[PDB]
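Worked example 3. Consider a protein that binds (4-acetylphenoxy)acetic acid.
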Amino acid sequence: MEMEKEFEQIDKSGSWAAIYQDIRHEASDFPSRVAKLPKNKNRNRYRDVSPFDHSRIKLHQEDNDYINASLIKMEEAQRSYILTQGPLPNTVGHFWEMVWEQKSRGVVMLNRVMEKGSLKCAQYWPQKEEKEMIFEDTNLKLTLISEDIKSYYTVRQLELENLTTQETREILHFHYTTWPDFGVPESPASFLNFLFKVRESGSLSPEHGPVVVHCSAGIGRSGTFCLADTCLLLMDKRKDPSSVDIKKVLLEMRKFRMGLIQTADQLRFSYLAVIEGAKFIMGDSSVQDQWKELSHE
Ligand SMILES: CC(=O)c1ccc(OCC(=O)O)cc1
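Given these inputs, the predicted complex is written out as structure tokens:
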């Protein structure tokens, strides 16, 4: 069923809250035993958001290999993502160790450091060229190289140095600075313009480790980003926008991490993003320039 027609049917009937609860009801449930070990309590931001044991990312150290992060492997789309929580004051070292060990090129951040007058994650990257960060626990140095600021989003070139070997890599930081907590982005066009900037960087390409995507919990906003990327990619491969069921893609993604898409509005936006983005995948290249203009970046 063409999702555009499923969309208008759900919209006119106002059954978004009902569709969403069906997804919640059928969603996978797997053990999270390592997350809930007492030694890992200060490594989790929320008590009710845990990585499954089968899909969790492991840190390469004998001490404690635990981080709140999950590998989402989409077999048909041939894309991988790591979804993680906003780093805590005591996990900033672990976060950059994961980025290093997994060979990621890109970090995608969908939240602000402060929202609704509370702290949603640590200031985990440097704000000035000449004030580099050193993570003593994981033996890494991080330096801001350059910054490109636009209306709603900012791209940063960072240099990550393994102090043990003196190897260095360029990491790209893609920061979306407009997405309300437990809410959907402003226009659909604006979100999509951000999505294509990440793609054009090569951060999502198979010659690199998986991209690291996060917000506060790493399930709501983060869920919306990788659901829309994967659905549009599946449209390109078989060329049948019709042969794409967004609900079934979501349930597949929820076998790897719990609670992806947190509200019935996030589910609705996801539909809007994919329907609007499909007006490109299917050969209207101009629409890209239109999104950029409509986004007023
Ligand atoms: C194998 C894989 O990544 C996958 C792709 C798509 C899935 O549902 C949607 C559909 O088939 O239209 C489920 C899983």
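Take a moment to read the result before moving on. Helices lie at 3-13, 16-26, 92-101, 188-200, 221-238, 246-253, 264-281, 287-295. Residues 74-77, 243-245, 248-249, 252 surround (4-acetylphenoxy)acetic acid (CB under 6 Å).
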